[PDB]
């Protein structure tokens, strides 16, 4: 139904968002970016692996949907439906056009919206998985399988940050002990030595 993904692999056009100028864009193939036990607290899943893009290219919303299912099914089978949390880190905002031929030719060749893609840079995280530290093997295998749904080269990388947080795993526990970090569900709020001293009193009372 759609052209082979080699036709829209490269970031050749400027970003083309669905806006008030580009009307008629069909809905993206991927509508869910978080799945698994999304409600696990920050402290339940210390491990985090990433699928990191090694190329500057465009991924179709179809391949994001395909990879998500691929990585999600393998985790449900090797860790259980409540043993992980998957977050797809790319959103298909750039719109790809089509100049449909059956005949004007190249006259009036500007194309109609055909789909959506995510523009991914080198070193940019495609999708992330957080789970328990004893499932590190199953995370790598899930992301290794999902690579086959994407064009180009992607690298797997087990992060040093605690879960989906921005704070290193080697010190995350210490910061929570002294109330520099406050769990707020999947993540942690950061407490600076700033602001009204009342907020400090509340945290220490």
């Amino acid at each position: 139904g759609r052209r082979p993904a080699r036709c829209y692999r490269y970031c050749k056009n400027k970003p083309y968002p669905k806006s008030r100028f580009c009307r008629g864009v069909p809905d993206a193939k991927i509508r869910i970016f978080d799945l698994g036990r999304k409600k696990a607290k920050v402290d339940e899943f210390p491990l985090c692996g990433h699928m990191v893009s090694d190329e500057y290219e465009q991924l179709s919303s179809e391949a994001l949907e395909a990879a998500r299912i691929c990585a999600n099914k393998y985790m449900v089978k090797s860790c259980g439906k409540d043993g992980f949390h998957i977050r797809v880190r790319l959103h298909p905002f750039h719109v790809i056009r089509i100049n449909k031929m059956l005949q004007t030719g190249m006259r009036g060749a500007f194309g109609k919206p055909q789909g959506t893609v995510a523009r991914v840079h080198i070193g940019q995280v495609i999708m992330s998985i957080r789970t328990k530290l004893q499932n590190k093997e199953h995370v790598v295998e899930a992301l290794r399988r999902a690579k086959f749904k994407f064009p180009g080269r992607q690298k797997i990388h087990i992060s040093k940050k605690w879960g989906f947080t921005k704070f290193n795993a080697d010190e995350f526990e210490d910061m929570v002990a002294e109330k520099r970090l406050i769990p707020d569900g999947c993540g942690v709020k950061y407490i600076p030595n700033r602001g009204p001293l009342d907020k400090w009193r509340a945290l220490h009372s």
Partner: protein, 293 residues
Amino acid sequence: FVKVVKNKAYFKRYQVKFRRRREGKTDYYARKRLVIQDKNKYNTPKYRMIVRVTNRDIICQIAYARIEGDMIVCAAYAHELPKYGVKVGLTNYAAAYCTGLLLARRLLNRFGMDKIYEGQVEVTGDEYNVESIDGQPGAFTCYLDAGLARTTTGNKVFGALKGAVDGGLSIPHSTKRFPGYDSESKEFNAEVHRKHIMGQNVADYMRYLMEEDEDAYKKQFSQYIKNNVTPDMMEEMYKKAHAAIRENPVYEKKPKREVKKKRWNRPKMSLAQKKDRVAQKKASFLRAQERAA
């Protein structure tokens, strides 16, 4: 619940107006037209007569604008009028006239043109404009800066303006806003204006109260009674004030006196003091918590 309008972003985008505007003192739409000189006149000063009536005082100043701020050429205050025999009513229309007259004479004395441009020595309350005398220094020209005052007929800024032109200052103006202008006929009654300049409307009120209710008279005119100012003598009180103003309009600055260095408000707490206070507060909070347990 509704969105906090004054959130963090409301302050990141907020643009404060000019300080004097925030204070509600200056009208910059009017100021731009009042003070800005034509560019082909270069450094030629553009003078204006600032009149500001406070709750208790009338300030008359002559100033021109410079880039660093206005320069006050001359200033006359109504609280100076007791030196000339006017003890009370220092914000009424007659006082405004005297203050403006005092401002005019003081300026002309300073430039040495007081003998040349004596203005209307005998007050008639009628349209008077000074004519520059050929072969003499030109008559001083200033414009009236009314400020935020509402310029209806009888506003006291025009009382000070009338006193200033009568002193020999050239100020463009019409009689439409002097007291005595009848809006219906579009005719101006000079005599009604003269009554106000002499405070007869104030004198009439005193009599009208005395004849009607004596108790109200004391409440309204308690300082007139104390200073022994009666309705009949007010007109000659003001006429004498004008002459004394004209006779010697110069200002003898109050002699400054060295005073003991005293501080009447706190200075800023230092970083160390502000830092220690937090440390003391934190120690106090935990100390209390331990006691409770």
